[PDB]
Design a protein around this motif. Structure first.
Motif, short mmCIF file in Angstrom:
data_model
loop_
_atom_site.label_atom_id
_atom_site.label_comp_id
_atom_site.label_asym_id
_atom_site.label_seq_id
_atom_site.Cartn_x
_atom_site.Cartn_y
_atom_site.Cartn_z
N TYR A 26 -37.89 -74.78 85.20
CA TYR A 26 -36.44 -74.23 84.25
C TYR A 26 -35.68 -73.60 85.98
O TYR A 26 -36.41 -72.60 85.71
CB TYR A 26 -36.79 -73.88 83.20
CG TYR A 26 -35.59 -73.13 82.45
CD1 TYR A 26 -35.14 -74.79 81.98
CD2 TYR A 26 -35.09 -72.53 82.31
CE1 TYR A 26 -33.52 -74.71 80.94
CE2 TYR A 26 -33.95 -72.37 82.02
CZ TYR A 26 -33.35 -72.86 81.02
OH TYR A 26 -32.08 -73.26 80.13
N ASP A 27 -34.26 -73.96 85.88
CA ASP A 27 -34.04 -73.45 86.98
C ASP A 27 -32.67 -72.64 86.62
O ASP A 27 -31.80 -72.96 86.92
CB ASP A 27 -33.48 -74.61 87.80
CG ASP A 27 -33.20 -73.87 89.68
OD1 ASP A 27 -32.92 -74.91 90.13
OD2 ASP A 27 -33.09 -72.70 89.44
N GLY A 28 -33.54 -71.32 85.30
CA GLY A 28 -32.34 -70.79 84.37
C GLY A 28 -32.44 -69.63 84.08
O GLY A 28 -33.95 -69.25 84.89
N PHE A 29 -32.42 -69.08 82.90
CA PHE A 29 -32.74 -67.83 82.39
C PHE A 29 -32.80 -67.92 80.91
O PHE A 29 -32.34 -68.51 80.40
CB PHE A 29 -31.47 -66.49 83.15
CG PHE A 29 -31.68 -65.83 84.42
CD1 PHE A 29 -31.21 -67.56 85.99
CD2 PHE A 29 -32.28 -65.00 85.23
CE1 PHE A 29 -31.54 -66.47 86.74
CE2 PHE A 29 -32.80 -65.39 85.85
CZ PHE A 29 -31.98 -65.99 86.96
N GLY A 39 -32.11 -65.48 78.58
CA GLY A 39 -31.43 -64.80 78.27
C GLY A 39 -30.23 -64.33 78.89
O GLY A 39 -29.78 -64.91 80.11
N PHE A 40 -28.95 -63.54 78.74
CA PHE A 40 -27.62 -63.95 79.07
C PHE A 40 -27.27 -62.00 80.23
O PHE A 40 -26.49 -62.47 81.27
CB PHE A 40 -26.31 -64.25 78.54
CG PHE A 40 -26.52 -65.50 78.14
CD1 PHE A 40 -25.47 -65.75 79.37
CD2 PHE A 40 -26.01 -66.23 76.81
CE1 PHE A 40 -25.03 -67.45 78.83
CE2 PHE A 40 -25.60 -67.32 76.75
CZ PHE A 40 -25.06 -68.03 77.63
N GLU A 41 -28.20 -61.55 80.09
CA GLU A 41 -28.10 -60.55 80.83
C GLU A 41 -28.66 -60.27 82.00
O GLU A 41 -29.45 -61.15 82.62
CB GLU A 41 -29.09 -58.99 79.97
CG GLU A 41 -28.79 -58.89 78.78
CD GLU A 41 -27.34 -57.85 78.29
OE1 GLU A 41 -27.34 -57.09 79.52
OE2 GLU A 41 -26.98 -57.63 77.41
N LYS A 42 -27.73 -59.73 83.00
CA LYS A 42 -27.78 -59.53 84.16
C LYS A 42 -29.17 -58.60 85.15
O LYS A 42 -28.62 -58.05 85.91
CB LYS A 42 -26.65 -59.52 85.11
CG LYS A 42 -25.87 -60.13 86.59
CD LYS A 42 -24.92 -59.69 87.41
CE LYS A 42 -25.13 -59.83 88.56
NZ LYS A 42 -23.92 -60.60 89.54
N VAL A 78 -34.49 -60.09 81.54
CA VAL A 78 -34.31 -61.42 80.54
C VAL A 78 -35.13 -62.05 82.52
O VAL A 78 -35.13 -61.77 83.89
CB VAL A 78 -33.24 -62.10 81.60
CG1 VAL A 78 -33.47 -63.55 81.10
CG2 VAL A 78 -32.65 -61.59 79.61
N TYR A 107 -37.26 -65.10 85.07
CA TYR A 107 -36.15 -66.47 85.36
C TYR A 107 -37.49 -67.40 85.79
O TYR A 107 -38.65 -67.26 85.60
CB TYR A 107 -36.08 -66.34 86.86
CG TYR A 107 -35.84 -67.68 88.17
CD1 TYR A 107 -34.74 -67.96 87.81
CD2 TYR A 107 -36.86 -68.06 88.91
CE1 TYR A 107 -34.15 -69.52 88.46
CE2 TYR A 107 -36.17 -68.81 89.30
CZ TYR A 107 -35.39 -70.12 88.96
OH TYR A 107 -34.87 -70.73 89.66
N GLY A 108 -36.53 -68.43 85.23
CA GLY A 108 -37.23 -69.88 84.83
C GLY A 108 -38.62 -69.68 83.71
O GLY A 108 -39.66 -70.19 84.20
#
Lengths: 218, 129, 221, 218, 218
Positions: C137-140, C142-145, C149, C151-152
């Motif tokens: 999975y090339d995403g996160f 949650g939305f928090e930077k 949260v 990675y992947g």
């Protein structure tokens, strides 16, 4: 001379434009002039280079009307037409491997912690392989041909075309923090235009066109 | 992919296709002799041995990439004496002609695939990890 | 050094269904019992065992129905203790302890068996929100930077948790109970095969490679 | 990509493969997988070179199954397909004249005695013209065009093809000590690839295929 | 006067040439003038003899074009026509039993270790039974008739013929170190040509013809 919407790009197509896994991209409440070619910044292919990679939804989050819709709209669904041009004389030599990796989970070397939002989400700038041989994935560059692949050979084949359909296990997904595709240009054989290094650049030109683009939530 | 997938299977047999792609300049020209030695036969050491066996004269000037179809081969690990199958060798037919512009150095890249006649039979764990 | 004349066969053995889809020992947890804790909690994932993890990571997306077979085992320092295996789906509070209210639920499926009985089986259907499991999975999530949260990690990919309780925990004898979990996919459908991995693993949550060296896979001639 | 029997050779044919005197070779008790291309050792075409010549039955007396049959069998009868490749860049210049001389009686200069078995029967190695201008025959290179001839011009025509039938006044003859044909490659104009003599080689590649081969006496 | 390919042998056939288990040998990428009779060295049948045996693929590994192909080619598949001639006058007497044992695993007497490559792979020379009564197999000569068998009785039947098909649990196998068949000639009753031992020889002549021969890998 290819052209989608308003923008046009001059191509040097001489062979069938292979669609990724033979599926032409298509869209199927949700849904329109943003389907145009975006030419990313040219990248210097030096003899000592490693390899570059752009995450397509990440690469187009800030580019024009597509970027504006992605920032506004909560979802998306879009195929991608990727055109790569390695511009060089007849004198230059080398090989670019263009691989459109689906779900390319970036992997740091000799660390416990995973890659953070900064290292993964380059955006329009794009990323650089720390270890091109291992694709920063634990895989091998030797095994990288299972993914939709093409060759820019500085003899004969001076341009590559990829046509990526909607590769995701949902009908729609989020662009802000998910990367379906990763277009990676990796120099298999180092550039050896031995002209006394008058111009060692031989810059690569990427051009991404979001085709069959739709969104949900105005 | 052939090696990684087949190491999950003890018993395998089938034909292969090997593609050699040249990575030199457009102006550069030369000849190679690519010979296939069937199993049992000693690997060639000189052009005269290569020119007698099933070979192809690969030319850079005309053809960018060459394809050689290796007929169906087989091997198994199954005391342990391992296994041996035929070789494929490449000999410099001529010099490498390059103008004043293009680099003296050139690179050749290898590619392998299994034809539709390939078969994997007995599933076992791969000792890679 | 070999005698191999292999006749042509069919393609039955080399099916994806017959490759990924058969039982594998994923979990081998043990629990002491002597004079409140030591209950069995296990996250359903294919990443625990390296061999099956690589075999699954050969493909990007794949759907299956999971047969979880629990094999009990008693190791005294044999009484027929009662075991309850509860399959808590994602988004339900995990059993805090052995004597927890979550066990006495009217919503969480479970099985009651004993040691001398045959090993227990459940078939959890294709459980994820997402229309197929994504190994990568090339995403996160949650939305928090933020580093909070991870990675992947697709939070839809979670198959839920399995919790085994020894009902007869308090017994006159001091012993150890070892639970074996066998995972068997069924009706496997695979899409977008990945490059086979070479280098070893560090953790289930991440794909870091430590290093057959990271600069050279094959032992150099 | 030409191929006879098992061996194959990549060609650059762009014009009709002229048969010597317009006769396609054919065989007519006597009679088989030895009809394959044999690529002889590459020869350096230096600027100061004179000219090379191979006697085809002599050239193939020791090469593979053909050589084995010739050593075993007392007779032969075989046509010859000769492919000559002068490999050079667009920058190089010069002209190779390929002449298939029938019965090229070698002639020494300023001696009474004739050429011995050593000077005539080079074999696979091939010979070198002492006086290219006189063909070592008392003839003139100006008159050498009566024989089956072709031109490798480093501009346009970078390869030559000759198809020699059975030229002998008997249905069959002996390979061990008779030479029906002599394939001679002579540089009419000296090689002038003036690149500072980075690579003065520009090597020639000969490839002979005995076609319609038959023998008498096992 | 039988003849396969070029070689011929004069026979004294007077009864149906029985095929081993009633199957005429046949071949079924792999595939040719080596199908000819090879007459092995004559063997002296003395009154005190024990019995001889030839392993057919072993016996033909070094004989002519068949031997050359076996040494070159990695596989084989071949039926065998075996002709045995015990040459003697009307005055001589005795019985030769010709048995074509399939997979005749040689067995040493009163040892732990098995027979080595030297004792098993005699080749053209052939072997000699240490204990003819037990076939060097742990079996009995009394039980040896289950295998394809024939009788040379010095009265009436002065020659034997065997036609062995491809007896192996694979379509093809290796000749260098596998022996499908073992042709064993065993004197059941001792030779008693009591002519004052003027000529006690009465030599046996073996002739093997590899029929329906094919190979894989040039």
């Amino acid at each position: 001379q290819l052209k989608l919407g308003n923008s046009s790009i001059v191509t040097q197509e001489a062979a069938n434009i292979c669609c990724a896994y033979g599926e032409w991209p298509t869209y199927l409440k949700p849904t329109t002039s943003t389907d145009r070619f975006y030419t990313l910044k040219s990248k210097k292919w030096e003899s000592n280079s490693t390899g570059w990679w752009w995450k397509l939804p990440d690469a187009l989050n800030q580019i024009g009307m597509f970027g504006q819709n992605v920032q506004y709209h909560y979802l998306y669904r879009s195929g991608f037409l990727c055109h790569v041009q390695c511009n060089a004389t007849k004198f230059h030599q080398g090989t670019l491997l263009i691989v459109a990796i689906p779900e390319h989970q970036i992997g740091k070397k000799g660390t416990g912690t995973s890659a953070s939002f900064a290292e993964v989400m380059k955006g329009a700038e794009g990323g650089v392989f720390e270890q091109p041989y291992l694709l920063d994935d634990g895989t091998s560059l030797a095994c990288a041909l299972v993914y939709p692949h093409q060759w820019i050979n500085l003899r004969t084949n001076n341009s590559a075309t990829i046509v990526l359909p909607w590769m995701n296990s949902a009908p729609m997904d989020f662009a802000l923090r998910h990367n379906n595709w990763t277009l990676a240009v990796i120099p298999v054989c180092p550039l050896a235009g031995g002209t006394g290094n008058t111009n060692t650049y031989v810059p690569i030109t990427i051009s991404i066109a979001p085709m069959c683009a739709e969104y949900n939530g105005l | 992919l052939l090696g990684n997938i087949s190491r999950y299977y003890t018993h395998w047999s089938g034909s292969l296709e090997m593609t050699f792609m040249f990575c030199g300049s457009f102006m550069t020209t030369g000849k190679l002799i690519i010979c296939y030695t069937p199993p049992g036969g000693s690997s060639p050491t000189d052009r005269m041995q290569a020119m007698l066996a099933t070979h192809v004269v690969w030319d850079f000037g005309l053809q960018s990439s060459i394809t050689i179809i290796i007929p169906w081969i087989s091997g198994s690990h199954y005391k342990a004496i391992n296994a041996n199958v035929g070789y494929v060798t490449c000999f410099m037919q001529t010099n490498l002609v390059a103008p004043v512009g293009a680099a003296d150095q050139c690179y050749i890249v290898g590619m392998v695939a299994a034809k539709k006649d390939f078969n994997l039979r007995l599933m076992r764990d791969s000792p890679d990890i | 050094q070999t005698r191999t004349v292999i006749n042509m066969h069919g393609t039955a053995e080399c099916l994806v269904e017959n490759f990924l889809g058969r039982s594998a020992l994923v979990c081998m947890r043990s629990f002491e019992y002597k004079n409140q804790k030591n209950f069995f909690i296990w996250t359903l994932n294919t990443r625990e065992l390296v061999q099956i993890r690589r075999k699954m990571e050969l493909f990007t997306y794949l759907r299956f129905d999971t047969e979880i077979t629990i094999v009990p085992t008693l190791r005294l320092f044999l009484p027929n203790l009662t075991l309850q295996a509860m399959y808590v789906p994602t988004g339900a509070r995990k059993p805090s302890s052995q004597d927890s209210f979550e066990w006495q639920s009217a919503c969480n499926p479970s099985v009651f068996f004993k040691i001398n009985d045959p090993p227990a089986r459940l078939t959890i259907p294709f459980m994820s929100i997402n229309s197929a499991y994504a190994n990568f999975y090339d995403g996160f999530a949650g939305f928090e930077k933020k580093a909070t949260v991870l990675y992947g990690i697709n939070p839809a990919n979670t198959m839920g948790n399995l919790c085994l309780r020894v009902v007869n925990s308090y017994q006159p004898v001091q012993y150890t109970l070892t639970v074996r979990v066998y995972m068997k996919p069924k009706h496997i459908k695979a899409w977008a095969p990945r490059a086979p991995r070479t280098m070893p693993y560090t953790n289930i949550l991440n794909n870091n490679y430590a290093g057959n060296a990271p600069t050279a896979i094959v032992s150099h001639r």
